[PDB]
């Protein structure tokens, strides 16, 4: 997260740190969202290589024990089936985690709030991209969970020439481009959390930013849209 301030240590329990095996130890790679004590919600691209992947909750600082952490195996991986690795833009970028335990809830261990089916968020609507990823763009990733105020950016706007124009698909959630703030590498998979109705719902995934790096005017972050996918989250829950 670029121009994030630290998290505090239980603003967002449903956040989790998928990692993967690298040696003798772990690296972090994506974020993620715990929707199920047994499943967690990510981006499809975070799991695209044949890596041995992690899923710690009750996460704070990556380097430091912070007493609260609970390390799970990922036993499953169902990718949406119409994701495309190299077409990014096409969308899709999801995918869901059964983890090999399931994990225990707790003031840092939550389930997290699912938007309905459907919802779409009014323009400049009050959200936080919260994750572990680099603190600037091509910089590198941060040791405790960051949080950054990214206002949502309706698609009307965000996909005009001006912003993301074509790039940008319905299916997609736009937050930020005020060239400050903004997710970067390592936030992917994780959540987006707006607020509505007085309640955070996670209403994105972290997806993509643009080529020209993280915090770039007018290239709002890109989220996989949450409530565009309720269905085929249930669907996948209730059969595996
Ligand atoms: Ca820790």
């Known amino acids: 997260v670029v121009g994030g301030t630290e998290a505090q240590r239980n603003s967002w329990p449903s956040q989790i740190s998928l990692q993967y095996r690298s040696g003798s ?4 790679t994506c974020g993620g969202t715990l929707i199920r004590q047994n ?5 499809a691209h975070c799991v695209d290589r044949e890596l041995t992947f992690r899923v710690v909750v009750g996460e704070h600082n990556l380097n430091q024990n912070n007493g609260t952490e609970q390390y799970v195996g990922v036993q499953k991986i169902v990718v949406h089936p119409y994701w495309n690795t190299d077409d990014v833009a096409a969308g899709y970028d999801i995918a869901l985690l059964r983890l090999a335990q399931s994990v225990t809830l707790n003031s840092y261990v939550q389930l997290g709030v699912l938007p309905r089916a459907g919802t779409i968020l009014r323009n400049n609507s009050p959200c936080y991209i919260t994750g572990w990823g680099l603190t600037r763009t091509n910089g590198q ?7 950054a105020y990214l206002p949502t950016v309706d698609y009307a706007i965000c996909s005009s020439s001006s912003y993301w124009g074509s790039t940008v698909k319905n299916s997609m959630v736009c937050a930020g ?4 703030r903004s997710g970067c590498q390592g936030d992917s998979g994780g959540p987006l959390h707006c607020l509505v109705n007085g309640q955070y719902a996670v209403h994105g995934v972290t997806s993509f930013v643009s080529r020209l ?3 770039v005017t007018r290239k709002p ?3 996989t849209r949450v409530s565009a996918y309720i269905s085929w ?4 829950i209730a059969s595996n």
């Not at 990733?141 to 949080?147: I, N």
């Open 39 to 43: 499943w967690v919600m990510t981006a």
């Open 177 to 180: 481009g005020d060239g400050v």
């Open 25 to 28: 130890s772990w690296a972090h």
């Open 213 to 215: 790096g993280c915090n």
């Open 141 to 147: 990733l941060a040791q405790t969970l960051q949080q």
């Open 221 to 223: 972050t890109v989220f």
């Open 233 to 236: 989250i249930n669907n996948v």
